[PDB]
Amino acid sequence: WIARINAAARQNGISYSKFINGLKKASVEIDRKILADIAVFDKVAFTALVEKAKAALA
Amino acid sequence: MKVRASVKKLCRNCKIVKRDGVIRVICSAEPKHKQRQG
Amino acid sequence: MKTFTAKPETVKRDWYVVDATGKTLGRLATELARRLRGKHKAEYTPHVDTGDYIIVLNADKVAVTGNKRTDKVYYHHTGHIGGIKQATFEEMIARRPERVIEIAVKGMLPKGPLGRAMFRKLKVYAGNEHNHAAQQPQVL
Amino acid sequence: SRVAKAPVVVPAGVDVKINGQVITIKGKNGELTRTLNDAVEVKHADNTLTFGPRDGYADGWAQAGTARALLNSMVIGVTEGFTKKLQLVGVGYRAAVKGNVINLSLGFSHPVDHQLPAGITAECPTQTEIVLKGADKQVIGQVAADLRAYRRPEPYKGKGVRYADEVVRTKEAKKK
Amino acid sequence: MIGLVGKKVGMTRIFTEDGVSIPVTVIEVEANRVTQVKDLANDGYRAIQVTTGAKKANRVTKPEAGHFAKAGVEAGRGLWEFRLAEGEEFTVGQSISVELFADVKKVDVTGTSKGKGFAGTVKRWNFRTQDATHGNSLSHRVPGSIGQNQTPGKVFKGKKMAGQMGNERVTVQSLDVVRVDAERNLLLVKGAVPGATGSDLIVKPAVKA
RNA sequence: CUCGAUGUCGGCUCAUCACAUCCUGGGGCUGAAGUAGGUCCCAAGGGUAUGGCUGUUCGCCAUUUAAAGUGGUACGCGAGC
RNA sequence: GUGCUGAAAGCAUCUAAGCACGAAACUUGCCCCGAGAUGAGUUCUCCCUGACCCUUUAAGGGUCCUGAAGGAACGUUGAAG
């Protein structure tokens, strides 16, 4: 799961190391991985989810 | 002789030299004490 | 449902052309080894059959960092006992980059079967652009 | 101790032509050129030059030292001319210049000719010498080495190809 | 760069007080060049050669047709050559048993080592003591019993075991030449020469260098 | 570790590696004239004795040789003698 | 191992820049094997150009008519076994 997230999320800025950290900051925003495979079916979602972290990282 | 041992410079007219560590003892005097540990 | 994207049996293969005429030598192997697996790749669940498709050019332009230009054990012992062991320093072998050096990726892959699938299957050469004995079509 | 390197004037006949790493210097005898520090360059104001490292540390100033000293021998080379004799000590020994093919008879069965790499002339005044005539002390060096190396004088006689001024303590002998 | 020809026995020319002439008759029947290539799809220089009275009537088919590429008379098996700056399909396509290679020099030959079939230690070495008569235990010829006791060992690959035998290359090298009668094809050497009338031999100048 | 068995020394056969090299190859010093040596460095390509006495390994002795290397391999080698 | 030129270190220095030599060792040269070199390479030459059908149709499955180049088989054999 992380092997692909680390392979998907990083291609569009911020590595898996930084990713979950952005994601980490939230009141409700935390939906775990597993479904994390969004990179395979809802790429738009996923890349729209990388901003949820990239722009999120203080 | 060329001396492979591990001594030092010694003497006066003998140079140290550093091409590989060679304590050396080169002196126009005698090649005897050259001490090139190689 | 069970999440895991299948193994379309090496679904797609994106062609590429490195340069190797660069200055990174040994450093390059990783982004060369990661690539033929599932680096830039997101989906196509690795572990199972997969890969990509890139290619090296001259590569003859490498120096490594330290005096590695002069080292690198390199021996290709054979099933011959009788005391063999063919040691040749890097520069001594760099005279004809064959199954080695440029092929520094082999030791970096999963090894054995399947990893073996990628292996030299990226092509190497040593002259960059001229008569690309390799597939001329689509590449980046 | 205190070192230095800076005094290198451009006399007459010579000619400067810098180019960063690469550099030459025309003159009666000729010119030259050679690699140097990449991120570093010299500087030709007027008559003298000023080599200079673009970084302050240990392996710095040291590079200049060999630079400016190397250029010295250049001007000296193209203008002054470089020489270095060799006296043949030993009976049958006699060097005979024939242009680019010095013919030597040093005891070894058969004579031995030392083709001289284009760049240095020689002309043994007597049937016993060897005088170098070039501009590159570098280059003349080797030729001078191989010349003596043909049969360098051994400490027991001196009978060998000793340099003209080659102070040899051939005083070596006996038993006991 | 030269021709090949069946050995066919050997004799001498027993000089009065000598017999130094101990050659081996090697009928050097010319070849058929015309066949070669360069860089346009192939290797290097090369030069095909074929000489013998193959029944062009019936035996070999495709090769006879393969020979049609501007050649003449298909013989036995064709061999190749290399550089030397020779002629080509631009003048004839028919070598001879002599040219510029010189004379009197030494010419090496490479017959076909016979083959005594399977052979042993004693055989492929000619060294291994023991008796026979009060023996009948290790009766000489045994490998002589080779190996260890309790040891890594690996029987040590490559150790000279029995092994077999059979047609194999050889190459003598050197061997001067006492005579030659061009056209007549009659080359002579100086003893040696592998094979026994049933070979081919390559008879090259002399790779002495 | 083996006592519900891993056969001892020496020889024969046939070996394979190490290098702390015996011969040969290249060097430095010598209290090295030369010839021959002394010692140390480098070097494992290849080569490296027949007999007398003894079970011997070894050793001493006769006579060779360029030389008769030191050592590891269950003090190599008995489902090989 | 020998050196050149050469600073660091007003000299010196075989080295730090930079060039040159240099052994039976190493790569090659010589002989043999060698494309299962699955990374299965190259070149030359030879041979095959008749009809239909059912499918779940680009996958095929199947019938008749054909069968070449070549190979093999058999026999007479071999300095090959």
PDB file of C-alpha atoms in Angstrom, chain E residues 2-194:
ATOM      1  CA  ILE E   2      46.260 -20.086 -47.718  1.00  0.00           C
ATOM      2  CA  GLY E   3      44.802 -23.346 -49.049  1.00  0.00           C
ATOM      3  CA  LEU E   4      43.795 -26.720 -47.587  1.00  0.00           C
ATOM      4  CA  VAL E   5      44.293 -30.217 -49.069  1.00  0.00           C
ATOM      5  CA  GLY E   6      44.050 -33.876 -48.140  1.00  0.00           C
ATOM      6  CA  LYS E   7      47.212 -35.190 -46.495  1.00  0.00           C
ATOM      7  CA  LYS E   8      47.515 -38.579 -48.175  1.00  0.00           C
ATOM      8  CA  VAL E   9      50.454 -40.507 -46.698  1.00  0.00           C
ATOM      9  CA  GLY E  10      54.010 -39.343 -46.196  1.00  0.00           C
ATOM     10  CA  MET E  11      57.448 -40.398 -47.380  1.00  0.00           C
ATOM     11  CA  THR E  12      60.988 -39.078 -47.526  1.00  0.00           C
ATOM     12  CA  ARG E  13      63.565 -38.235 -50.159  1.00  0.00           C
ATOM     13  CA  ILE E  14      66.362 -40.102 -48.494  1.00  0.00           C
ATOM     14  CA  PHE E  15      69.235 -37.961 -49.527  1.00  0.00           C
ATOM     15  CA  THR E  16      72.420 -39.875 -50.184  1.00  0.00           C
ATOM     16  CA  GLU E  17      73.902 -39.194 -46.722  1.00  0.00           C
ATOM     17  CA  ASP E  18      70.855 -37.728 -44.981  1.00  0.00           C
ATOM     18  CA  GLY E  19      67.248 -38.581 -45.559  1.00  0.00           C
ATOM     19  CA  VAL E  20      66.866 -35.190 -43.917  1.00  0.00           C
ATOM     20  CA  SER E  21      64.118 -34.917 -46.457  1.00  0.00           C
ATOM     21  CA  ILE E  22      61.486 -36.568 -44.283  1.00  0.00           C
ATOM     22  CA  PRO E  23      58.451 -34.550 -45.516  1.00  0.00           C
ATOM     23  CA  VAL E  24      54.892 -35.747 -45.880  1.00  0.00           C
ATOM     24  CA  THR E  25      53.252 -35.612 -49.289  1.00  0.00           C
ATOM     25  CA  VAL E  26      50.367 -33.157 -49.059  1.00  0.00           C
ATOM     26  CA  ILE E  27      48.880 -32.813 -52.543  1.00  0.00           C
ATOM     27  CA  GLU E  28      48.086 -29.090 -52.555  1.00  0.00           C
ATOM     28  CA  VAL E  29      45.327 -28.846 -55.147  1.00  0.00           C
ATOM     29  CA  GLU E  30      44.283 -25.205 -55.739  1.00  0.00           C
ATOM     30  CA  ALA E  31      41.050 -23.609 -54.523  1.00  0.00           C
ATOM     31  CA  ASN E  32      38.142 -21.511 -55.746  1.00  0.00           C
ATOM     32  CA  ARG E  33      38.050 -17.996 -54.317  1.00  0.00           C
ATOM     33  CA  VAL E  34      35.439 -15.615 -55.736  1.00  0.00           C
ATOM     34  CA  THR E  35      33.600 -15.952 -52.426  1.00  0.00           C
ATOM     35  CA  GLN E  36      34.191 -13.311 -49.759  1.00  0.00           C
ATOM     36  CA  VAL E  37      32.674 -10.258 -48.083  1.00  0.00           C
ATOM     37  CA  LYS E  38      33.681  -7.118 -46.157  1.00  0.00           C
ATOM     38  CA  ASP E  39      31.573  -4.778 -44.017  1.00  0.00           C
ATOM     39  CA  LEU E  40      28.287  -4.884 -45.897  1.00  0.00           C
ATOM     40  CA  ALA E  41      26.659  -7.621 -43.844  1.00  0.00           C
ATOM     41  CA  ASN E  42      29.298 -10.144 -42.618  1.00  0.00           C
ATOM     42  CA  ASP E  43      32.519 -10.304 -40.594  1.00  0.00           C
ATOM     43  CA  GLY E  44      35.934  -9.258 -41.883  1.00  0.00           C
ATOM     44  CA  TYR E  45      37.940 -10.271 -44.940  1.00  0.00           C
ATOM     45  CA  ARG E  46      37.505 -14.012 -45.354  1.00  0.00           C
ATOM     46  CA  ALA E  47      37.733 -16.189 -48.454  1.00  0.00           C
ATOM     47  CA  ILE E  48      35.948 -19.451 -49.205  1.00  0.00           C
ATOM     48  CA  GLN E  49      37.961 -22.413 -50.436  1.00  0.00           C
ATOM     49  CA  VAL E  50      36.854 -25.783 -51.805  1.00  0.00           C
ATOM     50  CA  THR E  51      38.921 -28.490 -53.468  1.00  0.00           C
ATOM     51  CA  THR E  52      38.112 -32.111 -54.207  1.00  0.00           C
ATOM     52  CA  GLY E  53      36.324 -34.298 -56.709  1.00  0.00           C
ATOM     53  CA  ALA E  54      32.913 -34.348 -55.066  1.00  0.00           C
ATOM     54  CA  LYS E  55      30.519 -36.205 -57.343  1.00  0.00           C
ATOM     55  CA  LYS E  56      28.761 -33.113 -58.650  1.00  0.00           C
ATOM     56  CA  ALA E  57      26.354 -35.681 -60.078  1.00  0.00           C
ATOM     57  CA  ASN E  58      24.555 -36.719 -56.888  1.00  0.00           C
ATOM     58  CA  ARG E  59      25.265 -36.361 -53.158  1.00  0.00           C
ATOM     59  CA  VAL E  60      25.255 -32.670 -52.317  1.00  0.00           C
ATOM     60  CA  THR E  61      22.434 -30.479 -53.631  1.00  0.00           C
ATOM     61  CA  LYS E  62      21.841 -27.087 -51.978  1.00  0.00           C
ATOM     62  CA  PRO E  63      25.593 -26.547 -51.742  1.00  0.00           C
ATOM     63  CA  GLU E  64      26.062 -27.052 -55.499  1.00  0.00           C
ATOM     64  CA  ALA E  65      23.374 -24.431 -55.974  1.00  0.00           C
ATOM     65  CA  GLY E  66      24.900 -22.330 -53.219  1.00  0.00           C
ATOM     66  CA  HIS E  67      28.049 -22.486 -55.297  1.00  0.00           C
ATOM     67  CA  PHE E  68      26.315 -20.888 -58.287  1.00  0.00           C
ATOM     68  CA  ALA E  69      27.121 -17.452 -56.858  1.00  0.00           C
ATOM     69  CA  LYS E  70      29.694 -16.932 -59.630  1.00  0.00           C
ATOM     70  CA  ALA E  71      31.911 -19.923 -58.858  1.00  0.00           C
ATOM     71  CA  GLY E  72      33.182 -23.068 -60.553  1.00  0.00           C
ATOM     72  CA  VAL E  73      33.090 -26.758 -59.635  1.00  0.00           C
ATOM     73  CA  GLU E  74      31.816 -27.491 -56.133  1.00  0.00           C
ATOM     74  CA  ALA E  75      34.225 -29.640 -54.135  1.00  0.00           C
ATOM     75  CA  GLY E  76      33.967 -30.852 -50.546  1.00  0.00           C
ATOM     76  CA  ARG E  77      33.517 -28.671 -47.472  1.00  0.00           C
ATOM     77  CA  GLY E  78      34.388 -25.017 -47.836  1.00  0.00           C
ATOM     78  CA  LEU E  79      36.763 -23.237 -45.485  1.00  0.00           C
ATOM     79  CA  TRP E  80      37.443 -19.528 -44.996  1.00  0.00           C
ATOM     80  CA  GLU E  81      40.416 -17.186 -44.693  1.00  0.00           C
ATOM     81  CA  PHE E  82      41.288 -13.644 -43.645  1.00  0.00           C
ATOM     82  CA  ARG E  83      43.217 -10.532 -44.610  1.00  0.00           C
ATOM     83  CA  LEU E  84      46.329 -10.608 -46.781  1.00  0.00           C
ATOM     84  CA  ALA E  85      45.032  -8.344 -49.531  1.00  0.00           C
ATOM     85  CA  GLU E  86      44.111 -11.062 -52.022  1.00  0.00           C
ATOM     86  CA  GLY E  87      42.194 -11.061 -55.292  1.00  0.00           C
ATOM     87  CA  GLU E  88      38.438 -11.499 -55.520  1.00  0.00           C
ATOM     88  CA  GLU E  89      35.268 -12.036 -57.535  1.00  0.00           C
ATOM     89  CA  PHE E  90      36.503  -9.156 -59.669  1.00  0.00           C
ATOM     90  CA  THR E  91      39.067 -11.062 -61.744  1.00  0.00           C
ATOM     91  CA  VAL E  92      38.710 -14.819 -61.663  1.00  0.00           C
ATOM     92  CA  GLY E  93      37.523 -16.758 -58.637  1.00  0.00           C
ATOM     93  CA  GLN E  94      40.174 -19.425 -58.805  1.00  0.00           C
ATOM     94  CA  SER E  95      43.226 -19.498 -56.549  1.00  0.00           C
ATOM     95  CA  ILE E  96      46.235 -21.747 -57.172  1.00  0.00           C
ATOM     96  CA  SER E  97      48.762 -23.777 -55.186  1.00  0.00           C
ATOM     97  CA  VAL E  98      51.270 -20.918 -55.161  1.00  0.00           C
ATOM     98  CA  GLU E  99      51.597 -17.129 -55.330  1.00  0.00           C
ATOM     99  CA  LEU E 100      53.545 -14.568 -53.284  1.00  0.00           C
ATOM    100  CA  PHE E 101      53.601 -16.291 -49.866  1.00  0.00           C
ATOM    101  CA  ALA E 102      57.337 -16.901 -50.470  1.00  0.00           C
ATOM    102  CA  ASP E 103      59.324 -20.143 -50.331  1.00  0.00           C
ATOM    103  CA  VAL E 104      61.630 -22.284 -48.171  1.00  0.00           C
ATOM    104  CA  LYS E 105      60.043 -20.663 -45.118  1.00  0.00           C
ATOM    105  CA  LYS E 106      58.226 -22.855 -42.588  1.00  0.00           C
ATOM    106  CA  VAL E 107      54.589 -23.769 -43.143  1.00  0.00           C
ATOM    107  CA  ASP E 108      52.472 -25.145 -40.300  1.00  0.00           C
ATOM    108  CA  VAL E 109      49.856 -27.844 -40.816  1.00  0.00           C
ATOM    109  CA  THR E 110      46.762 -28.996 -38.889  1.00  0.00           C
ATOM    110  CA  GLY E 111      45.637 -32.533 -39.633  1.00  0.00           C
ATOM    111  CA  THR E 112      42.930 -34.357 -37.717  1.00  0.00           C
ATOM    112  CA  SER E 113      44.126 -36.118 -34.580  1.00  0.00           C
ATOM    113  CA  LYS E 114      42.927 -39.699 -35.038  1.00  0.00           C
ATOM    114  CA  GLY E 115      41.368 -40.874 -31.815  1.00  0.00           C
ATOM    115  CA  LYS E 116      42.042 -44.192 -30.124  1.00  0.00           C
ATOM    116  CA  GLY E 117      38.499 -43.972 -28.877  1.00  0.00           C
ATOM    117  CA  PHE E 118      38.025 -44.138 -25.123  1.00  0.00           C
ATOM    118  CA  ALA E 119      41.420 -43.859 -23.401  1.00  0.00           C
ATOM    119  CA  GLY E 120      42.720 -43.912 -19.855  1.00  0.00           C
ATOM    120  CA  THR E 121      45.076 -42.336 -17.362  1.00  0.00           C
ATOM    121  CA  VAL E 122      47.926 -44.542 -18.491  1.00  0.00           C
ATOM    122  CA  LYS E 123      46.731 -43.776 -22.031  1.00  0.00           C
ATOM    123  CA  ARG E 124      46.156 -39.998 -21.961  1.00  0.00           C
ATOM    124  CA  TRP E 125      49.385 -39.418 -20.040  1.00  0.00           C
ATOM    125  CA  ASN E 126      51.698 -42.412 -20.360  1.00  0.00           C
ATOM    126  CA  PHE E 127      52.428 -42.409 -16.637  1.00  0.00           C
ATOM    127  CA  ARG E 128      51.236 -44.659 -13.779  1.00  0.00           C
ATOM    128  CA  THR E 129      53.313 -47.390 -12.188  1.00  0.00           C
ATOM    129  CA  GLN E 130      52.432 -50.758 -10.677  1.00  0.00           C
ATOM    130  CA  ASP E 131      52.748 -54.386 -11.678  1.00  0.00           C
ATOM    131  CA  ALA E 132      50.537 -57.048 -13.219  1.00  0.00           C
ATOM    132  CA  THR E 133      51.792 -60.425 -12.186  1.00  0.00           C
ATOM    133  CA  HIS E 134      51.857 -60.511  -8.297  1.00  0.00           C
ATOM    134  CA  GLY E 135      49.438 -57.718  -8.458  1.00  0.00           C
ATOM    135  CA  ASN E 136      46.212 -58.682 -10.029  1.00  0.00           C
ATOM    136  CA  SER E 137      45.100 -56.199  -7.341  1.00  0.00           C
ATOM    137  CA  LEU E 138      45.911 -52.870  -8.864  1.00  0.00           C
ATOM    138  CA  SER E 139      47.066 -54.445 -12.168  1.00  0.00           C
ATOM    139  CA  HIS E 140      48.995 -51.472 -13.464  1.00  0.00           C
ATOM    140  CA  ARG E 141      46.652 -49.625 -15.830  1.00  0.00           C
ATOM    141  CA  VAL E 142      44.187 -48.612 -13.093  1.00  0.00           C
ATOM    142  CA  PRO E 143      43.641 -44.858 -13.006  1.00  0.00           C
ATOM    143  CA  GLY E 144      46.024 -45.870 -10.407  1.00  0.00           C
ATOM    144  CA  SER E 145      43.276 -45.001  -8.076  1.00  0.00           C
ATOM    145  CA  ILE E 146      42.993 -41.090  -7.742  1.00  0.00           C
ATOM    146  CA  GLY E 147      41.260 -38.823  -5.186  1.00  0.00           C
ATOM    147  CA  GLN E 148      41.084 -38.149  -1.444  1.00  0.00           C
ATOM    148  CA  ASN E 149      39.521 -39.783   1.722  1.00  0.00           C
ATOM    149  CA  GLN E 150      37.361 -37.486   3.635  1.00  0.00           C
ATOM    150  CA  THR E 151      37.775 -34.165   1.886  1.00  0.00           C
ATOM    151  CA  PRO E 152      36.022 -31.220   0.307  1.00  0.00           C
ATOM    152  CA  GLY E 153      37.361 -32.448  -2.874  1.00  0.00           C
ATOM    153  CA  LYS E 154      35.008 -32.145  -5.816  1.00  0.00           C
ATOM    154  CA  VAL E 155      37.069 -34.940  -7.350  1.00  0.00           C
ATOM    155  CA  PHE E 156      38.623 -31.747  -8.618  1.00  0.00           C
ATOM    156  CA  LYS E 157      37.069 -30.908 -11.957  1.00  0.00           C
ATOM    157  CA  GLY E 158      39.300 -31.276 -14.979  1.00  0.00           C
ATOM    158  CA  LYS E 159      41.606 -33.863 -13.440  1.00  0.00           C
ATOM    159  CA  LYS E 160      42.776 -36.195 -16.198  1.00  0.00           C
ATOM    160  CA  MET E 161      40.411 -39.151 -16.101  1.00  0.00           C
ATOM    161  CA  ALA E 162      39.784 -41.802 -18.695  1.00  0.00           C
ATOM    162  CA  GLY E 163      38.119 -39.701 -21.330  1.00  0.00           C
ATOM    163  CA  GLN E 164      37.639 -40.791 -24.899  1.00  0.00           C
ATOM    164  CA  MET E 165      39.344 -39.895 -28.135  1.00  0.00           C
ATOM    165  CA  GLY E 166      38.426 -39.108 -31.708  1.00  0.00           C
ATOM    166  CA  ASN E 167      38.952 -36.768 -34.630  1.00  0.00           C
ATOM    167  CA  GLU E 168      40.275 -33.499 -33.216  1.00  0.00           C
ATOM    168  CA  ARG E 169      42.273 -30.519 -34.451  1.00  0.00           C
ATOM    169  CA  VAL E 170      45.962 -30.201 -33.643  1.00  0.00           C
ATOM    170  CA  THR E 171      48.267 -27.720 -35.359  1.00  0.00           C
ATOM    171  CA  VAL E 172      51.967 -28.572 -35.487  1.00  0.00           C
ATOM    172  CA  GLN E 173      53.412 -25.135 -36.257  1.00  0.00           C
ATOM    173  CA  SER E 174      56.841 -24.589 -37.841  1.00  0.00           C
ATOM    174  CA  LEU E 175      57.986 -27.370 -40.184  1.00  0.00           C
ATOM    175  CA  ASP E 176      60.025 -26.102 -43.138  1.00  0.00           C
ATOM    176  CA  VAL E 177      59.326 -27.309 -46.679  1.00  0.00           C
ATOM    177  CA  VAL E 178      61.688 -29.222 -48.966  1.00  0.00           C
ATOM    178  CA  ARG E 179      59.723 -29.008 -52.217  1.00  0.00           C
ATOM    179  CA  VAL E 180      56.639 -28.141 -54.253  1.00  0.00           C
ATOM    180  CA  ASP E 181      55.408 -28.766 -57.789  1.00  0.00           C
ATOM    181  CA  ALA E 182      52.609 -26.334 -58.640  1.00  0.00           C
ATOM    182  CA  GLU E 183      49.725 -27.574 -60.799  1.00  0.00           C
ATOM    183  CA  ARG E 184      51.095 -31.059 -60.102  1.00  0.00           C
ATOM    184  CA  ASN E 185      50.091 -30.233 -56.547  1.00  0.00           C
ATOM    185  CA  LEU E 186      52.867 -31.823 -54.509  1.00  0.00           C
ATOM    186  CA  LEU E 187      53.744 -30.046 -51.285  1.00  0.00           C
ATOM    187  CA  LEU E 188      56.260 -31.544 -48.866  1.00  0.00           C
ATOM    188  CA  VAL E 189      57.035 -30.762 -45.224  1.00  0.00           C
ATOM    189  CA  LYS E 190      59.224 -32.603 -42.707  1.00  0.00           C
ATOM    190  CA  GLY E 191      57.459 -35.452 -40.944  1.00  0.00           C
ATOM    191  CA  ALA E 192      54.793 -34.721 -38.329  1.00  0.00           C
ATOM    192  CA  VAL E 193      51.439 -33.780 -39.910  1.00  0.00           C
ATOM    193  CA  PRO E 194      48.382 -35.059 -37.956  1.00  0.00           C
TER     194      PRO E 194
END
